C-alpha cells in the first residue's frame, strides 16, 4: 500500500507496448520523471493476478532488473516502473543504432543480462520468460531484465506449471515443454537461445525451422546450427546452456564470468 501513489501524479504520453493483458505507456510522474506505466485490460486477468507481478518486484531489486516505482490499486490498476529509453533488445538490435554494435558490445550486454540473471538465481527465483524481447535497453546502452509476470520464487526444488499452460517452444527448455517443470536451469537454456538473438541482431532462433522440426532435431541430439558470424567460443558457451540434463547446465554467475572474459578479450 506504501507503494501507492494518487493517479493524478501520472500523465501518459504514448503507448510503448501492448499485450494480452493490457498496455504499457510512457509517462511522467509528478511532471519531471519518465516512467513506464503498465495497465490491466479489465477482464483479461484478475486485479490480484495483475498486481502479483508488482509484489514480486518489491522483493527483487537490483540495478540489472527493471525497478518497480509505484502502483495504482484502483481501477484502472497501474504498475509503474523504471523507464528504459531504448526499448526491447530484440527491436533495438535491428535499429540503425543497434546494427552498428560490435561483437565486443554484444558480449558486454550478454554478460550484463547474465549478471541480472545471477542475482535472480542467488535469490531463489526463476523468470521463465527469458528472451531478447524481455530485455530492456537504457539510454546508456545497459540492459535490464523485464517482465516478471511468469517469475516465481522457488522454495521446494522446482516449479510445475498448470496443465493447460503453453510456452514459446524455440525459447523453452525441453523439460519445461515436456512436463511443465521449470527451474533456474530452464532459464539457463533460454539464455543460450537469447545469446543467438544477440549475435544475429534480433533474428528468430533456428532459422528456417518450424516448431515441430525444432522438437525433433533436439530429441536426436542436434542443437541450433552455429549462427552466422558467431564466435566459436560463444557458440560453445551456448552449447553448455543446452545440455540435456538440466543439472549439467552452468550457473548464471559462471555464464557472466565467462562472458566478461570474452568481453575483455575483444
Closest CA to 145 of 109, 181, 177: 109
Query: Virtual CA dihedral for 207, 98, 230, 192, nearest 10 degrees?
Result: -70
What span, in angstroms and rounded, lies between the C-alpha atoms of 226 and 224? 6
What span, in angstroms and rounded, lies between the C-alpha atoms of 186 and 181? 8
If you compute the radius of gyration of the chain from its CA atoms, what whole number of angstroms results?
Answer: 19
What span, in angstroms and rounded, lies between the C-alpha atoms of 238 and 236? 5
What span, in angstroms and rounded, lies between the C-alpha atoms of 116 and 165? 26
Helix axes 252-264, 103-122, angle to 10 degrees: 160
236 is in an annotated binding site: no
Q: Which three cell numbers stand for residue 187?
A: 532459464
Catalytic residue among 108, 129, 147, 187: 129
Would you say 122 and 115 are in contact if contact means Cβ atoms under 8 Å apart? no
Given in angstroms, what resolution was this structure solved at? 2.2
129 is catalytic: yes
Indicate the pairing of strand 135-137 with strand 143-145. Answer: antiparallel
21 is in an annotated binding site: yes
Query: Virtual CA dihedral for 60, 66, 68, 72, nearest 10 degrees?
Result: -130
Q: CA distances (Å), 47 to each of 3, 13, 67, 76, in order? A: 16, 24, 20, 9
Q: Return all residues near 222 (Cβ < 8 A) that are at least 6 apart.
A: none
Gap sites in the chain (C to N > 2.5 Å), preceding residue numbers = none
20 is in an annotated binding site: yes
Sheet containing 78-82: give its strands across: 10-19, 22-29, 33-39, 78-82, 68-72
Q: Which three cell numbers stand for residue 27?
A: 509517462
Q: What are the residue boundaries of the structural domains of the chain, listed by start? A: 1-83, 84-265
Question: Residues, the chain, total?
Answer: 266
Q: For residue 177, report the phi and psi dihedrals to the nearest 5 degrees.
A: -75, -40
**What fold is seen in the domain 84-265?**
Transferase(Phosphotransferase); domain 1 (1.10.510)
18 is in an annotated binding site: yes
Query: Virtual CA dihedral for 22, 28, 30, 33, nearest 10 degrees?
Result: 120
Q: Which three cell numbers stand for residue 120?
A: 535472480
Q: Which three cell numbers stand for residue 163?
A: 496443465
Q: Which three cell numbers stand for residue 251?
A: 550457473
98 is in an annotated binding site: no
- Asked if the peptide bond before residue 76 counts as cis, ω within 30 degrees of 0, the response is yes
22 is in an annotated binding site: yes
What span, in angstroms and rounded, lies between the C-alpha atoms of 222 and 228? 17
23 is in an annotated binding site: yes
194-229 burial, b if ≥16 CB within 10 A, otherwise e? bbbbbbbbbbebbeebeeeebeeebeeeebbebbee
DSSP string across the chain:
-TTB--GGGEEEEEEEEEETTEEEEEEEETTTEEEEEEE--BTTB-HHHHHHHHHHHHH---TTB--EEEEE-SSSPEEEEE--TT-BHHHHTTSHHHHT--HHHHHHHHHHHHHHHHHHHHTTEE-S--SGGGEEE-TTS-EEE---SS-EE-SSS-EE--TT----TTTS-HHHHHH-EE-HHHHHHHHHHHHHHHHTTSPPSSTT--HHHHHHHHHTT--PPPPTT--HHHHHHHHHHT-SSGGGSPPHHHHHHHHHHHHHT-
What span, in angstroms and rounded, lies between the C-alpha atoms of 246 and 113? 20
What span, in angstroms and rounded, lies between the C-alpha atoms of 134 and 79? 17
1-83 belongs to which CATH class? Answer: alpha beta
Closest CA to 127 of 206, 35, 60: 60
Closest CA to 74 of 42, 104, 120, 44: 42
Amino acid at each position: 500500500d506504501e507503494w501507492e501513489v494518487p493517479r493524478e501524479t501520472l500523465k501518459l504520453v504514448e503507448r510503448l507496448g501492448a499485450g494480452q493483458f493490457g498496455e504499457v505507456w510512457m509517462g511522467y510522474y509528478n511532471g519531471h520523471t519518465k516512467v513506464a506505466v503498465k495497465s490491466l485490460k479489465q477482464g483479461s486477468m484478475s486485479p490480484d493476478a495483475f498486481l502479483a507481478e508488482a509484489n514480486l518486484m518489491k522483493q527483487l531489486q537490483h540495478q540489472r532488473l527493471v525497478r518497480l516505482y509505484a502502483v495504482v490499486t484502483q481501477e484502472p490498476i497501474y504498475i509503474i516502473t523504471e523507464y528504459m529509453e531504448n526499448g526491447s533488445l530484440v527491436d533495438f538490435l535491428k535499429t540503425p543504432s543497434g546494427i552498428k554494435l560490435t561483437i565486443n558490445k554484444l558480449l558486454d550486454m550478454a554478460a550484463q543480462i547474465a549478471e541480472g540473471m545471477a542475482f535472480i538465481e542467488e535469490r531463489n527465483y526463476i523468470h521463465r520468460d527469458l528472451r531478447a524481447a524481455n530485455i530492456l535497453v537504457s539510454d546508456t546502452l545497459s540492459c535490464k531484465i523485464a517482465d516478471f509476470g511468469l517469475a516465481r520464487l522457488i522454495e521446494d526444488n522446482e516449479y510445475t506449471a498448470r496443465e493447460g499452460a503453453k510456452f514459446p517452444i524455440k525459447w523453452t527448455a525441453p523439460e519445461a515443454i515436456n512436463y511443465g517443470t521449470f527451474t533456474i536451469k530452464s532459464d539457463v537454456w533460454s539464455f543460450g537461445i537469447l545469446l543467438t538473438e544477440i549475435v544475429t541482431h534480433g533474428r528468430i532462433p533456428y532459422p528456417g525451422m518450424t516448431n515441430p522440426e525444432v522438437i525433433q532435431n533436439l530429441e536426436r541430439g542436434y542443437r541450433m546450427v552455429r549462427p552466422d558470424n558467431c564466435p566459436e567460443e560463444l557458440y560453445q558457451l551456448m552449447r553448455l546452456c543446452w545440455k540435456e540434463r538440466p543439472e549439467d547446465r552452468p550457473t548464471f554467475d559462471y555464464l557472466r564470468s565467462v562472458l566478461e572474459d570474452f568481453f575483455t578479450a575483444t
